[PDB]
């Protein structure tokens, strides 16, 4: 086995996977009036890249979306797992009543890869956001399988800076437009010194409606 | 066997008789065919006793676990869907049962489920060998505008008619009323008897 | 049971009745046999209710997952092909169903699929015990040049004829119209009733 | 294998898992007149956290509840296992007569993960409390799978301080209200020096009744 | 075969005859069909001898293990439930038996369990080919207010009537009385014979 | 593999497990006239512990009992195994004629965990006592799977002192009361210097009868 | 396990496999007007080699082609896997609508070999190009399983030089002939100092048509 | 169903009709029974539609993969051999089909394969319920020296005769011509109709 | 696992297996007019050896032959595998159209033994020669599973010297007799200094014919 207890009761392989997540791109999510939104920073690298299929925000179904950070290959595997898990619940019961159950299924898979030798832990953190029978939900999940629910949270390299900005300026029941504006300011605050902020990805959903992916022009009128 | 379930404005009424045929004679005059399986959900069983009792135990466990894991009761339609999947999965080695599921989540609901997993929602339904006699009573007398008290009298009359014509049915009538305000309430037999006298059914 | 699907210039029209026989009598007069399974795709079911309902749930999940993974809707022919593979794989332990799949990807399409996985595209098709009566109406009155409004009247007349002659069919007629411009639109019953009076079908 | 005997007859991996439990939040339980109660300390961290789904006290069924400490991801796995185990007993027999059997099933699972190579031991301690045919019960369970029954016990970082306070002031057959008052004092005694005591989680059950989760206002009138 | 179990105020009385047909003749006149399976629990068997004897051994082991692991006796209803699950799990490859379980946990109980796992509680019950004759006696003479001594005479008379009319039954009658104060007590044959003379049954 | 031969032909992992047994509580058993008895020392630790479910003496059936020492979690697993093994023999044959066979089944399980890599050896010693077709029996079993039969023996930390006391004062065919008195004296001789002897657990069985668990008052009239 | 997290959150075995890819031959692909093209450098080594079955560009089907770099034996295994995966999709659905799904199946296989002990990661990078329902596509895939989509990209030893040349001179919607001419110039720019450029392999596909393999004479009229 | 395949000097001609019976009536008048499975290879199907369509998909995938892995088309005899192995491997759980495979590798070839995997090469062959009528036409009129144009007229006449006498056959005739110079060429329906008028077949 | 990536991207266990091949006997093959030939050096060691069953050239079928070098025991296993693979193709299709497919099946087996822990890589190199639908073919295969096609190639200890001789003197479409004469000269050039050249093994095949094994007298008239 690889993931074993250290003398002080720590799992080093889990800690090291957390370092891998610290290198990923920054993403954030927050709850607003009757809804929830997700933002992911799309740093431009080269003109030669097809900047249409980046798709940092991935739909799990019409009412659930996720954003990830860290090892991108491991992240794709977990997103696929979440989509299959969501479809299995709908087949068995006819609907998805609580998003928290779906997150726990994903986090249980991640926990399993920290207890059994012969495999390594996923180097990914995820944020899940959507609408269920209880209303707007917002969770994250770390490589160890730890789950928490937030009014607002962030992942990635700039997570510490974005959270501190949200720790001072975030409000509840904000309108969609104002909430999106607040999100950009938090994202801009973590930017590398005097770097410019390129067009990020925006998605939002409101009670009674399906997910909405913001168009490029709509995002353009926010910088 | 005779079971029945009807929907009213904001209530579900379910009722059965109690005769259990075994070894081709009337061995048990006081069986149980109506079960509460959740806070606002009930179930009636017809067919093979052993298969039905196993299914009742499975449903109680699954619904209880669901409510603990997701902090809310399973919706009635999801209860029917879960049952439909389990029955269909063994359709060639089946539970030989006919089931009724009724309850309240945001509106009253009654579902009829067959041995092959076919599930259909209806305003009212009846199962067992006495069911055709019940449908005759319901077709001529049921009304959606009935009060709860009127509905209880209706199901009692329907089952009493079945007991007069279906030899497989008999015994005391059990009745349950499900509402959001009061939950699952099993009517005490003393009121059932009192209504039977009042309705002229001896 | 009576289901029908027809293709017009840039539209697909699908329709069913609602009678569900169970326990060899008319237990449910208001069943559901027509389902939307994708943004521009519909499905009708005939045969064993339990088998059909399971298949509907499987198709909704697969199509939804396909559209998420590949960013486009599954083409109608691929929908029929996927169904054909699943049914044929269990041909000796089969789903005893007859299915119709219709929708629009770049042109309207209607596919008929049997229990053994045989899949054939057609301009129109009909399933269930009332289908032969429907084919008589369609053979004498169907025209490829009909407007959408004419097509809706045609399927209504065809199903009404089946209800007069097939005891297994009955109840209110459900109709869905699929176009690229408007998507999957379930006609409200009020227009269905209004057309029934206008066509002289009481 | 990882968990092997040391020269003095000790299992180091089991000992190290006990260190992980020492970092968890403090929880306690005690028996009172015709019942048993559970208390868990809900330390507030950030406003951004949704302090409704913390749910430190988890119901196993209507008559059995648990509280855990240590690796939270491992704790969620064991709680899920307990719920499934409880439902299996009810299906087989129609009822749950002795809670001790349910605890042993959980502890047997934990013992297994200390004897077979390729896996590591759960880093969790649990307290189970409820009513069965024998009456009010209160158990704990450690990472090794050791089970004990108590009139009163505690787990977590402040366990040593809380137990010492209970070792001097605990009484038997105390009324519910007085027992709850005593529990708060024990919890306050282990607090970090002059730290304030935020609203914790309270649950209780009485012979003939189901479990009760104390409301926020009810907990508020105890500080 | 004839077995019977009845409930009184704070006691359970169980009784059988002893004839075991094998190879289509009366090979063993002194078989055993009544068994103590727990401190306050008894069991009677009818049907295939081999299947029944295996079940008796399984129940003794399970109940003994249960009592050691949980420090209390298994409740009678749980005993019936455990049996119901085991029988139903092999319903298509079944133990061809009919069983009676009786005992005291906090009140007297008698349960009847069939080959498919159907389990029903009753005030009294009877199994085997002689059972219909027993039910005639019990229907006309049983009373809930009977003393233990009256109940023992009643079951003796009921089984004696069955032996006069069912060729598959015969031999000496075994009787067991279960109470909380005295536990499981097998009546010695000397009192059984003495009662038989006193009741005029020769 | 972990348990391998040392150059001098010793299995170190087996030896180390024997050290774990040396830390367990002291227990003893001896044969008396037409019977056998078991004694286990119940050291009191805290008032907060429920001193009713300690149950150091565990019944395997109505005629066989055991006491263990060492890793308590491993001991519970082996006791469960013994109970299932005993029930299997009764199902197959209708009775248990020789207790020695049951002990060998337990010791074979323990021997297996010393020869195959990927598992560690049980850190437990056990004493089995009961009545079978041959009469009163008394065995012990060590972590290696070694079995011996005795007129009197002891396990645990105080085993060396108790055995030496029995080596000089034990007699055969002693009456039950005198044998129990002798057992207390042996137990008191191993006590930590001038420590007091708290009420231990006593069990006994006589030919023709089932096992008897001594009541607290009966034990009280022996100190 | 071999592929484990380093203290800084890196997978060394994955990094080392990337070094193996750096030793492979240089290949490139770019999108042009209504199509996509692939170029692979065929360095001549010996006259004794049969320079007809080199086939650096491998067809996955009539509309999808790939080029690989790195461990050639591992590359052949992955190409075979891609062909079988493509045929399975066609059998199930009757067609291949999105090439991206096929790439993800290949990359998921490669990701699996980085998380489970007992196997090593594939030392290959691949470029996939073809026409699907969305149009012309161009992806690459690295040993970790990372996928990206490009207007133009390169793999192999000369990847850095070729990409820099494309980073300055690449244009969109270029005609086939001009795009092929641009590709040769990029390939020539990475050549070892004053080495000559031998006849490489060229393949292209246009919307509505199948793949075309350039003949030797056609390639000859480009140097 | 009627399918036919004939060999000429350097060509293979294959042809079918289009009627697909399902649910014991003429549900689809425009089915497809002739498929191109390789660059110079064709296939006709008779029997169970679902089984045949699955086999067509399998053959397209295998032949395509073969040609990619080995840089040449699979020889026609190897195509027949591969089919023979697959069918025989499930001979007791069989695909209930009759198949014709035709094509050109270095000479024209036509192979007939049955449900049990028996494969026989022939100069011409015919399958389906209309086949006996086709063999009568071929026996009296086929000649190895016919031109391609003469062969197309011959197969058209043969299938037309079958349609007059086999109720299971009907619809428009599809024809494919396979040569090395031109490859697999599906004759457009306009020439098929023109030939039908020219031959006096209305 | 044993075969893992080195920091510079190399598989050491694969490299070491290549050293084992370097110790094997020298063999060669070349294409001639409408055919291909194989030569293997049969060094005489002792009179006591039965020099009839050496059979360095092994027939895979009537139209395919192979020669190997390196670990002789591993070579026998791979030759057996090739023969079974060839028969499976003939059963499925009725013929063997392309020898390259057969070689890939062998090389895929060898590649597998370089990626999965618990096994070591085959220490063998092979040359395959024969006639198929495309005509005369000549391949080799190395321990890594690398395949190449040649007009002429060699394996074994003297491979470097023989290839250099062929690199300067080999011609195409040579008659059988002249090609065989050229092969002997290449073999003699690699001989240990002034060692004599003993009678080697010769095999050849021509389009339309089966394989021919040269008789001893025929080989004798070539030295």
Author numbering:
A (entry chain P), D (entry chain Q), F (entry chain R), G (entry chain O), I (entry chain U): 11 to 233
B (entry chain W), C (entry chain V), E (entry chain X), H (entry chain b): 1 to 202
Give passages from the manuscript.
The structure of the N-terminal tail in the closed gate conformation has not been well resolved in previously published structures of the T20S proteasome; thus, our high-resolution structures of the WT T20S (2.1 Å), ZYA-T20S (1.9 Å), and T20S-αL81Y (2.3 Å) provide insight to how the gate is stabilized in the close and open states. The WT T20S map does show clear pore-central densities that are expected for the closed gate. In addition, our WT map also resolves the N-termini up to Ala11, which includes 2 additional residues not previously resolved in the closed state. Our cryo-EM structure of the WT T20S now resolves more of the N-termini in the closed state, showing clear density beyond the prior resolved T13 to also show the location of I12 and A11. In this T20S model, the T13 side chain occupies the space between Helices 0 and 2 and I12 is seen binding to a hydrophobic pocket created by the neighboring subunits N-termini comprising A11, I12, and V14. Prior studies suggest the N-termini of the closed state in the T20S are disordered, but our WT structure shows a high degree of order up to residue 11 with residues 1-10 being disordered, though still occupying the central channel. For example, in the closed state, I12 is bound to the neighboring N-termini’s hydrophobic pocket, and T13 is bound under Helix 0; then in the open state I12 binds under Helix 0 and T13 binds near V129/R130 in the other neighboring subunit.
